Amino acid sequence: GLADALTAPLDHKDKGLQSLTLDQSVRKNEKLKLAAQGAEKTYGNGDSLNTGKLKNDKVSRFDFIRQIEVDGQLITLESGEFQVYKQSHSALTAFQTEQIQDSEHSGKMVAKRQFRIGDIAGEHTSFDKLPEGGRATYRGTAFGSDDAGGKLTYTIDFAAKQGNGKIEHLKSPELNVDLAAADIKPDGKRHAVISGSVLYNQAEKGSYSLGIFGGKAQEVAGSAEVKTVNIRHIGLAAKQELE
Amino acid sequence: CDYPDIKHGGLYHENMRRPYFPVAVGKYYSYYCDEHFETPSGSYWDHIHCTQDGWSPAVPCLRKCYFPYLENGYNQNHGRKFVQGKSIDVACHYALKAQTVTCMENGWSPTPRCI
């Protein structure tokens, strides 16, 4: 449903997540041109993105173009592939840079591959409304540049309000790290979040952040930034099996 | 390091991270720069590190000035991208009170224009 999400509008029988606000995916006065399967739309800082049309627990792919209006003229700043991983109460976007604006001339594009995680949204779980004991185990996907085959496993101890996970099966060994134990803290809006360190070979290589989503904290979504011998970003999305 | 104030940019996943400052040395986070701004890596985003001497880079976001088309001048530098701090001359067809233009934090100074 690629060419859908871009054209079709949010009607809501659709499975959730249904909408995704683009904030970190598009800057204040910049434009994000998405296209795929004979469809095309433009955004849009704050603009919504119809995800209800996309498939669940999978990566949706679109072609993209990042521009900026300079004197009544749009100037391309970057282009490549836009990725979207949707769940029931959460979702996130990623950018696979295939070409970026030259450093000397504005009108000349250069081939540069970069991967970064954009937005991480959904139905935030209230920190003040988290379970009080027990442990929820979340299984899901870990995806990086040219690899969406990563496996994510994350456990949460609501009593101790701590979390800890693991990344496996990523083509890049240096990315299959451990998500060290981290404390669940309240957001500025009192949304349950989790930030901690990332380890490879019992060695701190970076940090990770997760948001808890769904009224029953059924899901977790965020990203990891890992230092390798060549810094890489990893998209994270996991859910606890349904009853 | 306390939560980084970043002029002309900001940290990614700001609200997921904010609660864990001040952070320990060795820490570093991905950040982005605002329109008309780029990191020292040339991109509009890079990573900021917590060092003994505070956050690095010290100037995470830099203004880039695009050299405008000169109506009545030579346009050899037209479309050219310059970093905050550079000065140039305008070979005008016309002129600049006056003649050199610099890429300032707020943009070109003074406005590069002939007549």
Within 8 A by CB and 6+ apart from A189, the residues are A124, B15
Sorted by where each starts, the structural domains of chain B and their CATH numbers stand as 1-61 (2.10.70.10), 62-115 (2.10.70.10)
Separation between Cα atoms, residue A234 and residue A117, nearest integer Å: 7
Strand, coil or helix: what is A2?
helix
Contact B13 A225 (CB under 8 A): no
Within 8 A by CB and 6+ apart from B53, the residues are none
Task: Cite the residue boundaries of each domain of chain A with CATH code 2.60.40.1980.
Answer: 1-125
Contact A68 B26 (CB under 8 A): no
Please list every residue in chain A whose beta carbon sits closer than 8 Å to the beta carbon of residue B66: 70, 106
Q: Structure tokens of B86?
A: 């550079």
Q: Structure tokens of B78?
A: 């037209």
Separation between Cα atoms, residue A98 and residue A14, nearest integer Å: 32
Measured in angstroms, the resolution is 2.3
Q: Structure tokens of A237?
A: 């999305």
Q: What distance lies between CA B112 and its chain's CA centroid?
A: 18
Gyration radius of chain B over CA positions: 18
Return the beta strands (E) in chain A as ranges: 30-36, 39-43, 59-69, 74-86, 90-101, 109-110, 114-122, 135-144, 147-157, 162-168, 178-186, 192-199, 204-213, 219-226, 232-239
How many Cβ contacts (< 8 angstroms) between chains A and B? 69
Q: Please provide the DSSP assignment of chain B as one string.
A: -PPPP-TTEEETTHHHHGGG-S--BTBEEEEEE-TTEE-TTSSSEEEEEEETTEEESSS--EEEEEPPP-TTB--SSTTBEEETT-EE---B--------EEEETTEEES-----
Contact A187 B32 (CB under 8 A): no
The type of residue at A240 is Q
Cα separation of the two ends of chain A: 27
Tell me phi and psi for residue A179, to 5 degrees.
-100, 90
Contact B16 A107 (CB under 8 A): no
Query: Among candidates A206, A128, A203, A125, which has minimal Cα distance to A195?
Result: A206
Separation between Cα atoms, residue B102 and residue B115, nearest integer Å: 18
Separation between Cα atoms, residue A22 and residue A34, nearest integer Å: 12
Interface list for A 12-41 with B (CB within 8 A): 24, 27-30
Strand, coil or helix: what is A116?
strand
Q: Please provide the DSSP assignment of A135-156 as one string.
A: EEEEEEEEEETTEEEEEEEEEE
Architecture of the structural domain at A126-243? Beta Barrel (2.40)
CA angle A231–B64–B93, rounded 5-degree value: 150
Say if residue B110 is preceded by a cis peptide, omega within 30 of 0. Answer: yes
State the method.
X-ray
A102 and chain B in contact, CB less than 8 A: yes
Question: Could you tell me if B80 and B65 are in contact, meaning their C-beta atoms sit under 8 angstroms apart?
Answer: no
CATH (residue range A1-125): 2.60.40.1980
Task: Cite the residue boundaries of each domain of chain A with CATH code 2.40.160.90.
Answer: 126-243
CA angle A50–A54–A60, rounded 5-degree value: 110
Strand, coil or helix: what is A215?
coil
Separation between Cα atoms, residue A150 and residue A169, nearest integer Å: 5
Q: What distance lies between CA B11 and its chain's CA centroid?
A: 16
The helix (run of H) or strand (run of E) holding residue A5 is helix A2-5
Separation between Cα atoms, residue B55 and residue B21, nearest integer Å: 13
Strands across the sheet with B62-66, in order?
Answer: B37-38, B62-66, B81-83
Strand, coil or helix: what is A168?
strand
Within 8 A by CB and 6+ apart from A17, the residues are A51, A52, A86, A87, A88, A89, A90, A91, A121, A122, A123
